[PDB]
Design a protein around this ligand. Structure first.
Ligand SMILES: NC(=O)c1ccc[n+]([C@@H]2O[C@H](COP(=O)([O-])OP(=O)(O)OC[C@H]3O[C@@H](n4cnc5c(N)ncnc54)[C@H](O)[C@@H]3O)[C@@H](O)[C@H]2O)c1
Ligand SMILES: NC(=O)c1ccc[n+]([C@@H]2O[C@H](COP(=O)([O-])OP(=O)(O)OC[C@H]3O[C@@H](n4cnc5c(N)ncnc54)[C@H](O)[C@@H]3O)[C@@H](O)[C@H]2O)c1
Ligand SMILES: NC(=O)c1ccc[n+]([C@@H]2O[C@H](COP(=O)([O-])OP(=O)(O)OC[C@H]3O[C@@H](n4cnc5c(N)ncnc54)[C@H](O)[C@@H]3O)[C@@H](O)[C@H]2O)c1
Ligand SMILES: NC(=O)c1ccc[n+]([C@@H]2O[C@H](COP(=O)([O-])OP(=O)(O)OC[C@H]3O[C@@H](n4cnc5c(N)ncnc54)[C@H](O)[C@@H]3O)[C@@H](O)[C@H]2O)c1
Ligand SMILES: Oc1cc(Cl)ccc1Oc1ccc(Cl)cc1Cl
Ligand SMILES: Oc1cc(Cl)ccc1Oc1ccc(Cl)cc1Cl
Ligand SMILES: Oc1cc(Cl)ccc1Oc1ccc(Cl)cc1Cl
Ligand SMILES: Oc1cc(Cl)ccc1Oc1ccc(Cl)cc1Cl
Ligand SMILES: [Ca+2]
Ligand SMILES: [Ca+2]
Lengths: 268, 269, 269, 268
């Protein structure tokens, strides 16, 4: 409870449950005195975004299915009504916390499991959607010299069992972080990612052997534990804050050091 | 002219002209005594693949538009007729040398220029196609314990003007190199990539400011020059050869050292 | 002026002038309500550390030449007197902001300029010193579950003119960040680095063509500018703070995005 | 047995036994028709270098303790007698296959085990020695537009138990690959490294849990096995060959894919 984001405004995608990393990012931003707009992709998920809206006193709760150009365009329309008008216009940040590939893509042998359409959807929802948000948000961001933040996973650069086409999408996503940074930096907009360690979330639960992943990680990670959503929330807060004014194009690992260790006493 | 690939067989995609990197890869494999099957995506491009078939005495010239599952499945059917059968069955390698994004994606400001469909096509043709080839060729490869090779570019990990959506696709492609390696290694199949520096090819010609890119590169690269197609051909030959038996999941830079320099003396120029 | 480091304690090396990156790190920690101990390697430099002691109300100003095991051991003795004792014992962080190689190592052609002793001194003062601080400070750090922070430069992973032996030392330093993280993590100690872009500091001033380096950087960096000491100070504050509790072994670039660009439009200039 | 290095000359350091990676590199170069000069750091090790000299018909066997400027200067003196004179002067390559840190540095907890002098020696012998060879060899290399090759290990960029200060040295070494490449490229000299997976060698045997490292690696590596010295030999041959004319500053992993996998069914 400091007051680092007093009067700052953020759009937060990807809340699905109390376990969502985006939930904790919202919580961190709210704690620090920012105002929030929260998005949801459909009615089932709206139920849970509404709970988050209540807990964080969201300014609005707007539909945003990042699969639709119409949905995104309309969503940023609504946001502009609230935050695009009058004396203090603009937004300080947009949080992209959205991943999807069809479940079959992440079940078993990579070459067997990957399909043309699976790949298409994985890249579209998990990677292009970040640039889609940047396109719709550009002017709002430029007005306040805000930043974009996405979430990635080590699966982009190292192989983790079953991660498969999501690895291809995350690698694609991370390239976009760099291209957007180069594209938007001249307007004072920063673009960054957090590479989170494994955390029990709705999506996480869906991956074969994720539980085992969680166990192994704890035994590899220098801190001898996994990270919590709160720890990613705080790191996100930093990157979204004026304190990160010199940082763009950056991938920040929040994984208890996991990415730095090839083998531990897994040996034993 | 050594004889390092005597009696070995390779499928080579991506020949579009005498300037194609894939042309030089074919040339290197042929020089070393390998047999080739060459593929073409359409009739216009067949004209030039046929010239390469003549120069390299290709075993066959088969249609392969990597945008179509049908086209790929048919293509690897044809290749199975030639190479799938008998006591000598299998292929030693498949060379993926195919990139595409709609031209508009690579024209100016990244955020402005990138579109949902542009992205879709870029990843589909430039990245997924590599796994598509691995899927169709797996059995043929396993029979000889062959390898796959693709071509990437530094645009995956560093920003280069206009490269844009192709950078996203190349990053995706490189992740697939790693996933395919993990997936196919237990069947003795290796999967690798070459990150070539900039070279004047038909696709290269089409990128705004490519000529200028070429000029700056020459002044940044430790060897004070750009690489030729032949130098990529030779490196590809190595990775496709039994000499690279211990190497998989690898990205090998053939860029005269360009990727290792942040700034050169040019500090002046 | 928030109060994020209320009642936290930090040791800050590497203040040599008002321009030092370590000066701004001290300033950020003080601004946020932390107490500081500041170190100096010799009497000439003490003059400037004393000015920083006045501005930031340092708890103490202690000698610490990281070239001497004795000097370090004595220094951490003194700091233990102040901060080692009682129900509040321990330190929240140690800031390593020390680089040195003999000037001749950084003057021109790398192979010509690098010497056995130059290399020895560069690694000893620039890299081993970080583990030296971790060894002397381990117990104090563990008591509060604090962290170590060093400063590196892209010269470790990419070539920059004249950086030379300092590039070898920084690469070594970054490996130590990882080994220390692995070694100390089980005691709840985090170990991280900031890779700062180029900034006019006393050491920076001494590098041939640094001014030119600064000019090109500004034209390559996505933000179209260089960073200030303050921006490194703020990022350092974060990594030293409880907000970075889940982050260890990390190299965080604070360079306005410079490291992510291979070539900009400058293709022209 | 092709004839790719006909009439080419290479200096090969680091032969200590038949298990030395440098042994197999010599073997690969000889097989392909190159002539070799072999070096040894002292009399004990000379016994084994002499066996290699017999097997590969070395042109000379010269002393080179890379700890001494005198020793290196004298060594390259002798080499110049053989290969620096007359019509066809120069060398096509120098193979650096030398690592050392005092044994205590690699036994147990990194922070406990590392010492000021241990670090000094590790960097001096394992990293500076590569530039020392480049300095002494520059003119011989430039005459034939030869290349330098060193050997590194993933320990530089990822943590492996006990590798410790050798990790710091290897990271330093790899930076030197890049600096030397930049420095010498204008004279047509290339500079590269191979990052070999774990292989049973004299030095390897000396590291606590190396045997376990070997076991774990086999279960992580995509090829489901470790690499042999021969496979590194062949890759070294390529990098030292005219076929690698476009390649400088490169780290080439010869590790059966190990570096690319964060976790396998170590999970199981
Ligand atoms: N260990 C981990 O859980 C972990 C680690 C690193 C990265 N990540 C990344 O974190 C981000 C958030 O995921 P999470 O782990 O908190 O899981 P989660 O299930 O809480 O969040 C995933 C979100 O994606 C949203 N989404 C899916 N398709 C959408 C669409 N078409 N339009 C809009 N939203 C859509 C879902 O509604 C959901 O809120 C993802 O990008 C994920 O890949 C997760
Ligand atoms: N500087 C460079 O030229 C450079 C640098 C590194 C990477 N590469 C990569 O090397 C590969 C070859 O490109 P190039 O420079 O030799 O140019 P090129 O124009 O010769 O090759 C591109 C090839 O892709 C083919 N292709 C496009 N869509 C296809 C489809 N649907 N089905 C089948 N083939 C299709 C074209 O027919 C053509 O042969 C590409 O992956 C490219 O991105 C090029
Ligand atoms: N552009 C930049 O300025 C830049 C970029 C990134 C990295 N860094 C790193 O940041 C750190 C601080 O450098 P700076 O640029 O602020 O310059 P500076 O000249 O202010 O700092 C270098 C410091 O090292 C100290 N030092 C040297 N030998 C010492 C010894 N034996 N014992 C104790 N202290 C000793 C000097 O007293 C001085 O305070 C260094 O590690 C430097 O390499 C600087
Ligand atoms: N798994 C592995 O064995 C492995 C993997 C990757 C990297 N490497 C690297 O391979 C290289 C060769 O080592 P190896 O594994 O074949 O072991 P090895 O014991 O066969 O070779 C090490 C060599 O270093 C030499 N050396 C040590 N100090 C010297 C000095 N002062 N002057 C000259 N020579 C000196 C020794 O005489 C010996 O020949 C080393 O650089 C090593 O770090 C080894
Ligand atoms: O990327 C992730 C990485 C981890 Cl370790 C855990 C959860 C993740 O998030 C996802 C994983 C798969 C799918 Cl289909 C969608 C999402 Cl959001
Ligand atoms: O990847 C490349 C990199 C460079 Cl430097 C030059 C050409 C390249 O190849 C392409 C670039 C754009 C498109 Cl649309 C298609 C292809 Cl094949
Ligand atoms: O690492 C640095 C990087 C830059 Cl861009 C500028 C200054 C740096 O700091 C040093 C450079 C050389 C020496 Cl001898 C000592 C120090 Cl502190
Ligand atoms: O670097 C190596 C890496 C591995 Cl996995 C195995 C052996 C290696 O080589 C050495 C390791 C330690 C020391 Cl003291 C000296 C050398 Cl030559
Ligand atoms: Ca980082
Ligand atoms: Ca490589």
């Amino acid at each position: 409870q400091s007051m680092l984001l007093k009067g700052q405004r953020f759009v937060v995608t990807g809340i699905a449950s109390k376990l969502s990393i985006a939930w904790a990012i919202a919580e961190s931003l709210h704690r620090e005195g920012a105002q929030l707009i929260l998005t949801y992709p459909n009615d089932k998920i709206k139920k849970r975004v509404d709970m988050a809206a209540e807990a964080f006193d969201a300014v609005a709760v707007i539909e945003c299915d990042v699969g639709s150009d119409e949905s995104i365009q309309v969503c940023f329309d609504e946001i502009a009504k609230h935050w695009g008008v009058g004396d203090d216009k603009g937004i300080d940040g947009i949080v992209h916390a959205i991943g999807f590939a069809p479940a079959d893509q992440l079940d078993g042998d990579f070459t067997q499991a990957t399909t043309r359409e699976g790949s298409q959807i994985a890249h579209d929802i998990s990677s292009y959607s970040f640039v889609a948000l940047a396109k719709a948000g550009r002017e709002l961001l430029a007005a306040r010299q805000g930043s974009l933040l996405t979430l990635t996973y080590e699966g982009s650069i190292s192989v983790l069992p079953n991660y498969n086409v999501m690895g291809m999408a995350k690698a694609s996503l991370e390239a976009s972080v760099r291209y957007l940074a180069s594209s938007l930096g001249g307007e004072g907009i920063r673009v960054n990612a957090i590479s989170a360690g494994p955390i029990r979330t709705l999506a996480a639960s869906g991956i074969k052997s994720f539980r085992r992943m969680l166990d192994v990680s704890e035994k590899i990670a220098p801190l001898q534990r996994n990270v919590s959503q709160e720890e990613v929330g705080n790191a996100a807060l930093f990157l979204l804050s004026p304190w990160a004014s010199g940082i763009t194009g950056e991938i920040l690992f929040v994984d208890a050091g996991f990415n730095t260790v090839a083998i531990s006493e897994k040996i034993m």
